[PDB]
Amino acid sequence: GIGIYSPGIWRIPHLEKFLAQPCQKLSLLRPVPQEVNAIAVWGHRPSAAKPVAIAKAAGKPVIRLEDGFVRSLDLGVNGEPPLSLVVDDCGIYYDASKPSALEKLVQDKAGNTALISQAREAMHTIVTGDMSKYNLAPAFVARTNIVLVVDQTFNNMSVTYGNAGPHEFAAMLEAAMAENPQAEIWVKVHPDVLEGKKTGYFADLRATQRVRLIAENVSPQSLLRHVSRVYVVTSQYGFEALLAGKPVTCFGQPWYASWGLTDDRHPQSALLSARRGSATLEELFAAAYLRYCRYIDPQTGEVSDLFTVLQWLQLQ
Ligand SMILES: Nc1ccn([C@@H]2O[C@H](COP(=O)(O)O)[C@@H](O)[C@H]2O)c(=O)n1
Ligand SMILES: O=C(O)[C@@]1(O)C[C@@H](O)[C@@H](O)[C@@H]([C@H](O)CO)O1
Ligand SMILES: [Cl-]
């Protein structure tokens, strides 16, 4: 029932197990069939624009896909298939300009309360089992007052649609340095940049004695254990820091900002917080990791759950 134009999407292994619905390939060169009840695209990739306009003009709704928050062993830039996808029938999680399906799941508190025991169980497995979106980095080993500043991939869609850009990165690091005069500043490069497939926002940062550059691929939770507080623009690292029990200052508008849990600096923070309301950490985790994300079994490709994928990711 769902039409897909993107060959890249069409090509995702076990895609049909993620969508839980029949899917069919559509061509831009002919009308959308009436049978199609929705059109699915990848986030806001440039390829999504033409299918979005088509769907609008035929009155069909758009579904936006993206990788899950526990995705795979190696990076997507290296061609590793995903073990989790998100499926968003309202917007997409990283677009702060309007509600996403994730935002409405967070606000459905009753539905998150029903999952609190699974959420606590999975949260513990992630923090003490040292898990993250990617899971091939080795644990970190090595002053005690450390401020973590998180770099990202240049022009990533979670920055642009989270109302940020190069300025918020410069402002983030100047704020980190100025608000913690005696702390040591640690700038973590994104693994895609370390893989040489992307560039960072601090490409031309000059390191000092107080500003140390961490250009090593290390697992988030292990590095977080040595940090006092975290500064982000929009990175998923920010939510993982909250799971580690660390304070988080946000300079863009990611999916986990403006719920009452983060020190939000974006100029439109008050507007977004008014729309979102309040939420607990466990509500956010249940909504995002258990309800918004879908999983497949890594050995069979059949529909699965977070716990099965966490288990299979942990022995490697
Ligand atoms: N500076 C950074 C930024 C991201 N990452 C990794 O990349 C994942 C995704 O983060 P992004 O939203 O920044 O793409 C994180 O969960 C984390 O595993 C990292 O290890 N160091
Ligand atoms: O259409 C896509 O977006 C694509 O083919 C390219 C990348 O998004 C890449 O992540 C790929 C993965 O197979 C999905 O994670 O999907
Ligand atoms: Cl369980």
Numbering used by the authors: 1 to 142, 147 to 320
Anything the authors wrote about it?
KpsC is a dual-module glycosyltransferase (GT) essential for “group 2” capsular polysaccharide biosynthesis in Escherichia coli and other Gram-negative pathogens. Two separate GT modules in KpsC transfer 3-deoxy-β-d-manno-oct-2-ulosonic acid (β-Kdo) from cytidine-5′-monophospho-β-Kdo donor to a glycolipid acceptor. The N-terminal and C-terminal modules add alternating Kdo residues with β-(2→4) and β-(2→7) linkages, respectively, generating a conserved oligosaccharide core that is further glycosylated to produce diverse capsule structures. Based on the formation of covalent adducts with Kdo identified here by mass spectrometry and X-ray crystallography, we determined that catalytically important active site residues are conserved in WbbB and KpsC, suggesting a shared double-displacement mechanism.
To identify a more stable KpsC-NEc-Kdo adduct, an Asp160Asn variant was analyzed. However, as both a worse nucleophile and a worse leaving group, we rationalized that the resulting Kdo–Asn160 adduct would be significantly more recalcitrant to hydrolysis, allowing this intermediate species to accumulate. To determine the structure of the observed KpsC-NEc Kdo adduct, crystals of KpsC-NEc D160N were grown in the presence of 1 mM CMP before being briefly soaked in a CMP-Kdo–generating reaction mixture and then immediately frozen. In the resulting map, clear density was visible for the CMP nucleotide, which refined to an occupancy of 0.95. Additional density was associated with Asn160; this density was modeled as an α-Kdo adduct and refined to a final occupancy of 0.76, with atomic displacement parameters (B-factors) similar to surrounding residues. This adduct was modeled as being linked to the Oγ of Asn160. Finally, a less defined density peak stacked on Trp42 was modeled as a Kdo residue with partial occupancy (0.78). The α-Kdo adduct is stabilized in the active site by an extensive network of hydrogen bond interactions, mediated by a series of highly conserved residues. The observed binding mode places the exocyclic O7 and O8 nearest the CMP phosphate group, while the anomeric carbon is positioned 5.4 Å away. Nevertheless, the distance between the anomeric carbon and the CMP phosphate suggests that the adduct undergoes significant structural rearrangement after transfer of Kdo from CMP.
